Design a protein around this ligand. Structure first.
Ligand SMILES: [Mg+2]
Ligand SMILES: [Mg+2]
Ligand SMILES: [Mg+2]
Ligand SMILES: [Mg+2]
Ligand SMILES: [Mg+2]
Ligand SMILES: [Mg+2]
Ligand SMILES: [Mg+2]
Ligand SMILES: [Mg+2]
Ligand SMILES: [Mg+2]
Ligand SMILES: [Mg+2]
Ligand SMILES: [Mg+2]
Ligand SMILES: [Mg+2]
Ligand SMILES: [Mg+2]
Ligand SMILES: [Mg+2]
Ligand SMILES: [Mg+2]
Ligand SMILES: [Mg+2]
Ligand SMILES: [Mg+2]
Ligand SMILES: [Mg+2]
Ligand SMILES: [Mg+2]
Ligand SMILES: [Mg+2]
Ligand SMILES: [Mg+2]
Ligand SMILES: [Mg+2]
Ligand SMILES: [Mg+2]
Ligand SMILES: [Mg+2]
Ligand SMILES: [Mg+2]
Ligand SMILES: [Mg+2]
Ligand SMILES: [Mg+2]
Ligand SMILES: [Mg+2]
Ligand SMILES: [Mg+2]
Ligand SMILES: [Mg+2]
Ligand SMILES: [Mg+2]
Ligand SMILES: [Mg+2]
Ligand SMILES: [Mg+2]
Ligand SMILES: [Mg+2]
Ligand SMILES: [Mg+2]
Ligand SMILES: [Mg+2]
Ligand SMILES: [Mg+2]
Ligand SMILES: [Mg+2]
Ligand SMILES: [Mg+2]
Ligand SMILES: [Mg+2]
Ligand SMILES: [Mg+2]
Ligand SMILES: [Mg+2]
Ligand SMILES: [Mg+2]
Ligand SMILES: [Mg+2]
Ligand SMILES: [Mg+2]
Ligand SMILES: [Mg+2]
Ligand SMILES: [Mg+2]
Ligand SMILES: [Mg+2]
Ligand SMILES: [Mg+2]
Ligand SMILES: [Mg+2]
Ligand SMILES: [Mg+2]
Ligand SMILES: [Mg+2]
Ligand SMILES: [Mg+2]
Ligand SMILES: [Mg+2]
Ligand SMILES: [Mg+2]
Ligand SMILES: [Mg+2]
Ligand SMILES: [Mg+2]
Ligand SMILES: [Mg+2]
Ligand SMILES: [Mg+2]
Ligand SMILES: [Mg+2]
Ligand SMILES: [Mg+2]
Ligand SMILES: [Mg+2]
Ligand SMILES: [Mg+2]
Ligand SMILES: [Mg+2]
Ligand SMILES: [Mg+2]
Ligand SMILES: [Mg+2]
Ligand SMILES: [Mg+2]
Ligand SMILES: [Mg+2]
Ligand SMILES: [Mg+2]
Ligand SMILES: [Mg+2]
Ligand SMILES: [Mg+2]
Ligand SMILES: [Mg+2]
Ligand SMILES: [Mg+2]
Ligand SMILES: [Mg+2]
Ligand SMILES: [Mg+2]
Ligand SMILES: [Mg+2]
Ligand SMILES: [Mg+2]
Ligand SMILES: [Mg+2]
Ligand SMILES: [Mg+2]
Ligand SMILES: [Mg+2]
Ligand SMILES: [Mg+2]
Ligand SMILES: [Mg+2]
Ligand SMILES: [Mg+2]
Ligand SMILES: [Mg+2]
Ligand SMILES: [Mg+2]
Ligand SMILES: [Mg+2]
Ligand SMILES: [Mg+2]
Ligand SMILES: [Mg+2]
Ligand SMILES: [Mg+2]
Ligand SMILES: [Mg+2]
Ligand SMILES: [Mg+2]
Ligand SMILES: [Mg+2]
Ligand SMILES: [Mg+2]
Ligand SMILES: [Mg+2]
Ligand SMILES: [Mg+2]
Ligand SMILES: [Mg+2]
Ligand SMILES: [Mg+2]
Ligand SMILES: [Mg+2]
Ligand SMILES: [Mg+2]
Ligand SMILES: [Mg+2]
Ligand SMILES: [Mg+2]
Ligand SMILES: [Mg+2]
Ligand SMILES: [Mg+2]
Ligand SMILES: [Mg+2]
Ligand SMILES: [Mg+2]
Ligand SMILES: [Mg+2]
Ligand SMILES: [Mg+2]
Ligand SMILES: [Mg+2]
Ligand SMILES: [Mg+2]
Ligand SMILES: [Mg+2]
Ligand SMILES: [Mg+2]
Ligand SMILES: [Mg+2]
Ligand SMILES: [Mg+2]
Ligand SMILES: [Mg+2]
Ligand SMILES: [Mg+2]
Ligand SMILES: [Mg+2]
Ligand SMILES: [Mg+2]
Lengths: 187, 98, 134, 59, 76
RNA sequence: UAGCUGGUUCUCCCCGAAAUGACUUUAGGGUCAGCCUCAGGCGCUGACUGGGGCCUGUAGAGCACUGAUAGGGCUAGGGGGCCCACCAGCCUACCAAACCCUGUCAAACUCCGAAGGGUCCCAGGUGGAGCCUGGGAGUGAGGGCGCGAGCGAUAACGUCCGCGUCCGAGCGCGGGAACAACCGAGACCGCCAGCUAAGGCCCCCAAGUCUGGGCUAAGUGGUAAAGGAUGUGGCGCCGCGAAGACAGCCAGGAGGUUGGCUUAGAAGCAGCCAUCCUUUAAAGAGUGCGUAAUAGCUCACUGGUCGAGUGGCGCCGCGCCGAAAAUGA
RNA sequence: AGAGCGCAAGGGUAGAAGGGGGCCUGACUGCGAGGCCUGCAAGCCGAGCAGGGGCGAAAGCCGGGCCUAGUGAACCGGUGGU
RNA sequence: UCCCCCGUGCCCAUAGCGGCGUGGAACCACCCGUUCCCAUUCCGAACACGGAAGUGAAACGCGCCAGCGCCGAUGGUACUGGGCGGGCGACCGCCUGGGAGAGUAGGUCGGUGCGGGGG
């Protein structure tokens, strides 16, 4: 994804925001400078880009840049973005969360139940070349009481995990129900 | 276990540090508050013989020579990790010969 | 539970930490006004929720009453309230996420949460899991 | 730096004691009163804190 | 209601801050324990009170893992 | 006798409090301190301010300690079931110690930590500043308001502290309809002179029926909430459209099917569980009504006609309902 | 260092204030610069000087106890001593 | 001025935990022995004396690695001296000066002072 960025400086961050400009900061091992972007345009990008897909930033200098999103501070009350972090990549390995697709339906979901997705994505060390638009997991052998750890995953080539292997990815849990209530309130 | 040093440092000045080895015995006159040594009668660095308890009493006077020649007297004895008795007591007993 | 005894009232200042993001489930109900939420409130909402979609998905509750709410018994002015008549409440600054739902259609969770709102004193908002994460 | 010309425009009645002692420090007695003072970090230090009471100009 | 109780305020803490000139013998710091260690030209009493040992100037030294210290740099 | 109540007589001039602390058979009284005043003495120090040093654990945040806490994971212990007894094995949509992940709470928790405040040094600061010794006091029921906490009910013209402030003693003046403490402002005296402050400039009433651009149709404004609605104007987003939509009107709207199961009956239509195809342009194992169970009506969808826009959702401004009281509005 | 530090809590603390051992009685007399705290009266800390001592080779440390509670003006009377 | 080692300070984890490697000429340590000084609530483990042989295994010394630990910006925000503005309030908004914690990027397996022995 691409997005037109602009340089920032003395301008009051609050004043910017009144206009429509969400301030932010691109930086990395060697680089660092204040910037900003048009908020409305940012939203349209981030609604799919998030912290997973890469984002090329175009400065007025025409400079393309393979940035990522490292964090977006939010304003409590009317959940909304304050300011953006842009991690500019080079070619060396860089940690980042990658999406996950829990394809298939366990016996749990069929026999009444619900798949809780503990991690909607996973943190893995990888080169900017390897930007797998997603990993997959055959969640189907799962059932109420069962669980999947990172100790087993559709790890593509070159993509090694940085999170602990024993971290749980997801699990199927029993459903909340009405006939439980009569039993519950008894205690 | 260097409680001994802490206790001495609090007092006057001129700490007579007395490190000693399996076949060695050294001694410095350190005026702290600056971390500098003024005198240093080494043994296995001087040349002395071999008898240790007899050797230490000698190296003790080696300080006395170099000490007074500068103007020193605070006998503040840094009996290090070693208990005052053997080649230390002798090194001391000897130092106190002057 | 445990803690100890009864506790001062304090004040519900700005919703500084009174804000949040969804961390479980697809949909959520966030507060918009500061308030002490009672146990009787939290519960009544939670039950009325499942009660709505029987044998449905799974609900999460991220606010929890740890504050003892005191109350003198129809008299004058001695000592601290025997209190606890309303027992325990949870501090809620405007912006904090309270209830998560999961494993149900949008119209199935747009109602469940719509209701839980009513059982609450404050005005509240429903939310999709936007896309804001960490 | 060039001298400072300050003038009292809002009454101190109902303002903290320190703000009273400030005007007395600068030498502002009654209202609308003129007062020109060699500007130093010490003189401006009071003018600063009484800014909501006075209108200043450079001379 | 058994509760209306407390004990006298002991007015402890640092009694002479850094740079302040001091006469020999006068007090520098009263404290619960050794929230401040003595050091050069500063003695300590039964209650952990730190008192200057000679006319001079007070100065504080922090030494990390070894704690804070109060010193009187003499002059006369 | 009265630590109580009352009463205390001419004039002008200068300054001007307190309603707090400690102790008190003390609590509406006293002693000392605090604050007022007079006299003599010292003389740039005083409030406030600039620069610098040191002291600090609040706001905020945090979970590293002390505890609290939702979900999940891993996993002792215990519980149920298979199986049994020599005790052993496995299962465990039961409860759960420790541990870990995610997510959090705390006046008496803190890995952290402001703003600020305190103090000393240097400098500005001659002010009804300051300091030393004395003579004389009064005060020791405060009150409201802002801010920070406790108590209370996140009640009270409530109560108790803290920093301010005003009334007290400025019920003198202007504004606020009227009104100690809200806004403006510190009244030595005189003036049929001027500029302003708060607030105001249609009439009572001084001063614009001023200028320019919007919004509001309720008398809103002229003082009320959860919550409810095709109020009205405004920005944004998604989708349908001249390859013919939205609305209305002409026609079909089905077959196996009467879905499996519950049930006296459950024929798309009490509930439970749910994921076929086909005549075809289209009709969902079904939106609502109608039934005892059905047939009947309709949408959904497709065809025609028409001929230009239409439908949903998020955001902001002002407004509508919610809205019942006792002498006349 | 989450233990211990006689006893509530807090601060402090193993570079000991904690556990053990040898000798020991400074749980001394005569004082006390300068302070903390403070309305009064009280309370608290204290270097050093003199006497005669205890432990240490010595530098040194000792005027009770890791610290903050364990308390009572004056009057009146008891006992000992100059 | 340079290098190795010994002793001792200074700051007080970027100095630490751990994994790999290297050093015995010198220095250091383990190491031989327990007659003498000295020592064990038992024991030469410790303390101590007298000391060749062997060793660098242990300990320590130096150097590498970033798994733990530790350090950690910039940007923005919470909060807030001071000054104001809106609502019944529980509250909220602007100007001015100060400005976190968490988190992101990164950093670190140290830097140095005096004496002494040694090329
Ligand atoms: Mg639950
Ligand atoms: Mg009563
Ligand atoms: Mg009772
Ligand atoms: Mg005035
Ligand atoms: Mg005013
Ligand atoms: Mg001040
Ligand atoms: Mg009390
Ligand atoms: Mg009290
Ligand atoms: Mg400390
Ligand atoms: Mg002492
Ligand atoms: Mg006068
Ligand atoms: Mg006057
Ligand atoms: Mg008292
Ligand atoms: Mg009386
Ligand atoms: Mg008096
Ligand atoms: Mg002056
Ligand atoms: Mg701190
Ligand atoms: Mg807080
Ligand atoms: Mg940690
Ligand atoms: Mg704990
Ligand atoms: Mg405990
Ligand atoms: Mg398991
Ligand atoms: Mg078991
Ligand atoms: Mg068994
Ligand atoms: Mg068994
Ligand atoms: Mg088993
Ligand atoms: Mg706190
Ligand atoms: Mg505490
Ligand atoms: Mg701050
Ligand atoms: Mg200050
Ligand atoms: Mg200062
Ligand atoms: Mg003059
Ligand atoms: Mg005066
Ligand atoms: Mg005066
Ligand atoms: Mg003076
Ligand atoms: Mg007087
Ligand atoms: Mg009086
Ligand atoms: Mg009284
Ligand atoms: Mg009163
Ligand atoms: Mg007041
Ligand atoms: Mg208010
Ligand atoms: Mg206000
Ligand atoms: Mg009360
Ligand atoms: Mg409150
Ligand atoms: Mg009130
Ligand atoms: Mg009065
Ligand atoms: Mg006044
Ligand atoms: Mg009146
Ligand atoms: Mg008036
Ligand atoms: Mg009128
Ligand atoms: Mg009034
Ligand atoms: Mg009036
Ligand atoms: Mg008035
Ligand atoms: Mg005003
Ligand atoms: Mg008017
Ligand atoms: Mg209303
Ligand atoms: Mg209202
Ligand atoms: Mg209204
Ligand atoms: Mg409303
Ligand atoms: Mg309606
Ligand atoms: Mg469409
Ligand atoms: Mg065309
Ligand atoms: Mg229509
Ligand atoms: Mg028609
Ligand atoms: Mg038809
Ligand atoms: Mg028809
Ligand atoms: Mg048909
Ligand atoms: Mg049809
Ligand atoms: Mg029909
Ligand atoms: Mg069908
Ligand atoms: Mg039919
Ligand atoms: Mg019919
Ligand atoms: Mg809206
Ligand atoms: Mg709106
Ligand atoms: Mg309204
Ligand atoms: Mg009506
Ligand atoms: Mg009437
Ligand atoms: Mg601990
Ligand atoms: Mg402890
Ligand atoms: Mg203990
Ligand atoms: Mg103890
Ligand atoms: Mg403690
Ligand atoms: Mg230490
Ligand atoms: Mg002991
Ligand atoms: Mg001991
Ligand atoms: Mg003993
Ligand atoms: Mg003296
Ligand atoms: Mg004295
Ligand atoms: Mg006194
Ligand atoms: Mg008195
Ligand atoms: Mg002494
Ligand atoms: Mg003597
Ligand atoms: Mg002493
Ligand atoms: Mg003891
Ligand atoms: Mg002791
Ligand atoms: Mg002891
Ligand atoms: Mg204390
Ligand atoms: Mg008497
Ligand atoms: Mg050379
Ligand atoms: Mg290995
Ligand atoms: Mg050997
Ligand atoms: Mg023998
Ligand atoms: Mg011998
Ligand atoms: Mg002997
Ligand atoms: Mg030997
Ligand atoms: Mg080896
Ligand atoms: Mg090792
Ligand atoms: Mg290498
Ligand atoms: Mg690292
Ligand atoms: Mg890491
Ligand atoms: Mg910053
Ligand atoms: Mg209001
Ligand atoms: Mg409010
Ligand atoms: Mg700043
Ligand atoms: Mg930070
Ligand atoms: Mg390291
Ligand atoms: Mg270095």
């Amino acid at each position: 994804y691409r997005l037109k960025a602009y340089y920032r400086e003395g301008e009051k961050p609050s004043a910017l925001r009144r206009a429509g400009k969400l301030p932010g900061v691109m930086y990395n091992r060697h680089l660092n400078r204040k910037v900003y972007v048009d908020l409305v345009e940012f939203d349209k990008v981030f609604r799919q880009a998030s912290i997973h897909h890469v984002i090329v930033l175009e400065l007025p200098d025409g400079q393309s840049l393979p940035t990522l999103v490292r964090q977006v501070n939010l304003d409590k009350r009317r959940r909304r973005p304050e300011h953006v972090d842009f991690f500019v990549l080079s070619d060396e390995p860089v940690e980042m969360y990658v999406p996950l697709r829990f394809v298939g339906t366990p016996a749990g979901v069929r026999a009444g139940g619900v798949l809780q997705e503990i991690h909607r994505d996973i943190l893995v060390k990888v080169s900017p070349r390897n930007i797998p638009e997603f990993i997959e997991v055959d969640v189907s052998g799962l059932e109420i009481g069962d669980s999947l750890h990172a100790s087993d995953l559709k790890l593509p080539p070159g993509v090694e995990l940085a999170v602990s292997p024993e971290e749980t990815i997801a699990a199927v849990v029993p459903p909340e129900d009405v006939e439980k209530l009569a039993e519950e309130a008894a205690a | 276990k260097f409680r001994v040093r802490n206790r001495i440092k609090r007092t006057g000045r001129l700490r007579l540090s007395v490190f000693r080895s399996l076949k060695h015995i050294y001694a410095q006159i350190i005026d702290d508050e600056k971390g500098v040594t003024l005198v240093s009668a080494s043994s296995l660095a001087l040349k002395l013989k071999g008898n240790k308890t007899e050797v230490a009493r000698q190296v003790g006077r080696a300080l006395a020579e170099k000490a007074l020649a500068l103007g020193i007297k605070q006998v503040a004895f840094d009996r290090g990790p070693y208990k005052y008795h053997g080649r230390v007591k002798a090194l001391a007993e000897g130092a106190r010969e002057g | 539970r445990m803690k100890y005894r009864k506790q001062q009232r304090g004040r519900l200042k700005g919703a500084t930490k009174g804000g949040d993001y969804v961390a479980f489930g697809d949909f959520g109900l966030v507060a918009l006004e500061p308030a002490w939420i009672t146990a009787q409130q939290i519960e009544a909402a939670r039950v009325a929720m499942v009660r709505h979609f029987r044998r449905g998905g799974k609900i999460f509750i991220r606010i929890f009453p740890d504050k003892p709410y005191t109350k003198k018994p129809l008299e004058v002015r001695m000592g601290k309230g025997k209190g606890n008549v309303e027992g325990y409440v949870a501090v809620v600054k405007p912006g904090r996420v309270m209830f998560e739902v999961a494993g149900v259609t949008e119209e199935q969770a747009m109602e469940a949460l719509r209701i839980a709102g009513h059982k609450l004193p404050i005005k509240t908002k429903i939310v999709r899991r936007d896309a804001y994460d960490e | 730096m060039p001298r400072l010309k300050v003038k009292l425009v809002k009454s101190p009645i109902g303002y903290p004691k320190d703000q009273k002692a400030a005007l007395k420090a600068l030498g502002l007695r009654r209202l609308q009163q003129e007062r020109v003072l060699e500007d130093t970090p010490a003189i401006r230090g009071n003018v600063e804190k009484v800014a909501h009471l006075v209108r200043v100009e450079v001379v | 209601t058994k509760n209306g109780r407390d004990s006298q305020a002991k007015r402890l803490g640092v009694k002479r801050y850094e740079g302040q000139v001091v006469r020999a013998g006068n007090i520098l710091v009263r404290q619960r324990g050794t929230r401040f260690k003595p050091g050069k030209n500063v003695g300590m009493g039964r209650d952990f009170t730190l008192f200057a040992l000679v006319d001079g100037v007070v100065e504080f030294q922090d030494r990390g893992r070894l704690g804070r210290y109060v010193h009187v740099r003499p002059l006369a």
